[PDB]
């Protein structure tokens, strides 16, 4: 049998890399590849995606996002068309947690953890530096709601809830009241998670209230470090980063490897049916689709460039690698590593906010 897979990349060098990867894969039943470029608007993107589907009846679609604004404007139409035809779609560089709800996007996978999955590193950091009190500060949105829900579910084991959760509206010009209220409850460790363009206002406001002095400890995610959020930021802010969140060659190699292994494994079964080959003519489903997703979910890869690869029943990768870095004198520097296990510290002494080198107690 001859089965081919399709992808929607962002350039031509990525297309050449995909062709080389599939050429190396088929040299280890022949498979080909098909590629297309992104479009400014969603509707033409979706119709072109289903036209590409009808062209060769692609078993799976490898989608990716470019370094472009609007965030979730590029990967939505492909997911909607796939959900119309119930064919698997594998994402590469989509970090948002809206797609993690397995009710509206039944056919979707991720090669990178979502933005809301960086809630365990904070737990381990508190368990290592002996901090038991936090002040959660989030924006009123789906991302913040999911992050706070996951954090409280994780923290419910110790039967010690967060001291307070402060939700602020997404997009404003004065957040002075919330910070003034949260300044003096009882706690020092502040955990922030919001949009960078909204976190800049919080950073500017916190400087006027003298809350960035000695003693207080800050913690952030990844959106508060990149972008323009470095204009206003107190030194000593501890942040997290993904080790291989930008180099897409390794991601495409791992994705093509796992897809090839899955397509090799499925064909050994029986009672299969080819997916529909028309975006226009056919108005039916691809019944032997969920079985492919189920056999792909447990596709425990042996080894690769990005380490071991696995999956959960949520369309998210496990066993991620995180780097814990500190901002010293407007210059980032890595200070620790986290490999799913306990956090391993490096040979560098961090600088806590306000100067001085001594682990703050965090409680008054």
């Amino acid at each position, epitope marked *: 049998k001859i089965v081919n897979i399709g992808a929607v990349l962002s350039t031509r060098k990525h297309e050449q890399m995909f062709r080389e990867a599939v050429n190396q894969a088929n040299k280890r039943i022949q498979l080909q590849a098909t590629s297309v470029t992104h479009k400014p608007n969603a509707i033409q993107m979706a119709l072109s995606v289903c036209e590409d589907l009808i062209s060769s009846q692609v078993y799976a679609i490898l989608v990716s996002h470019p370094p472009t604004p609007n965030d979730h404007f590029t990967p939505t139409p492909v997911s909607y068309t796939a959900g119309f035809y119930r064919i698997p779609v594998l994402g590469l560089t989509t970090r948002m947690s809206i797609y993690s709800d397995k009710s509206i996007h039944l056919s979707f996978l991720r090669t990178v953890p979502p933005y809301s999955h960086q809630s365990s590193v904070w737990f381990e950091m508190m368990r290592v530096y002996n901090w038991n009190h936090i002040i959660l500060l989030v924006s009123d949105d789906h991302e913040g709601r999911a992050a706070q829900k996951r954090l409280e579910t994780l923290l419910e084991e110790r039967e010690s809830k967060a001291e307070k959760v402060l939700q602020f509206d997404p997009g404003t010009k004065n957040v002075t009241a919330l910070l003034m209220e949260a300044r003096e409850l009882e706690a020092r460790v502040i955990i922030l998670s919001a949009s960078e363009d909204d976190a800049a206002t919080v950073y500017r406001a916190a*400087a006027m209230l003298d809350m960035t002095g000695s003693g207080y400890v800050w913690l952030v995610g990844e959106r508060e470090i990149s972008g323009n959020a470095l204009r206003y930021a107190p030194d000593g802010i501890i942040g997290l980063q993904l080790i291989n969140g930008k180099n897409e060659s390794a991601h495409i190699s791992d994705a093509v490897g796992v897809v090839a292994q899955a397509v090799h494994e499925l064909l050994e079964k029986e009672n299969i049916t080819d997916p529909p080959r028309g975006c226009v003519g056919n108005t039916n489903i691809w019944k032997t689709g969920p079985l492919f997703k189920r056999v792909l979910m447990s596709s425990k890869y042996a080894d690769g460039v990005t380490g071991r690869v696995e999956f959960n029943e949520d369309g998210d990768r496990k066993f991620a690698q995180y780097s814990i870095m500190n901002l*010293q004198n*407007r*210059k980032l520097v890595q200070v620790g590593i986290y490999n799913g296990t306990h956090v391993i510290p490096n040979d560098r*002494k961090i600088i806590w906010p*306000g100067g001085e080198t001594e682990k703050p107690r965090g409680y008054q």
Partner: antibody
Amino acid sequence: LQLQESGPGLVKPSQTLSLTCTVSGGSISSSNWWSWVRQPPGKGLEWIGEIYHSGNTNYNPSLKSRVTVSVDKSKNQFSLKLTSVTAADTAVYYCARDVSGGVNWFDPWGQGTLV
Amino acid sequence: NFMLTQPHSVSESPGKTVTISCTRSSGSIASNYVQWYQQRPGSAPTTVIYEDNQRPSGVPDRFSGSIDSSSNSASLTISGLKTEDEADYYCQSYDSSTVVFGGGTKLT
């Protein structure tokens, strides 16, 4: 607070550099940073690296594995230990202090040392 | 790292206003603003412009700073030129990696 350049002031090639700053009127144990900006003759400027008072010293990617900066509070001075300097690195070296604040601000500078 | 470009050989009669534009080579000056230092022949450089809007205590009010965000450059304006303005002016910036100094200009 006032600082002046010091050191042995050698010009021989294929050796190691060693020179220390002065800083009188200030305290090494503080919340500032000390830089070692280097000025080549007849050209622009080039930053070398800063050093915090207690434990950690930043650097520059180019000469990252060829230079070393040390401090000593007992003698109230910090010194530069450039290694494997060739004959193409002739320049006049400055001693610079920067205020932490929120940004970099290399002021006040030093008198400068010929090299 | 990146590079900085500055105009060269700019001078005129006293009493005029001159704008010197220090331009980013690659990227955008929007997350890390620049500063302007001045140097006297035979003397150590001294800062005159910091955060492009503020001035150090005792500095003359003739000099001023401005931003454009269009050509990715910072402008330093000198009004009422005097015989003591002949010096070397350097623009200095930084990023998330390091600190790099500009080429600099001379004013006669």
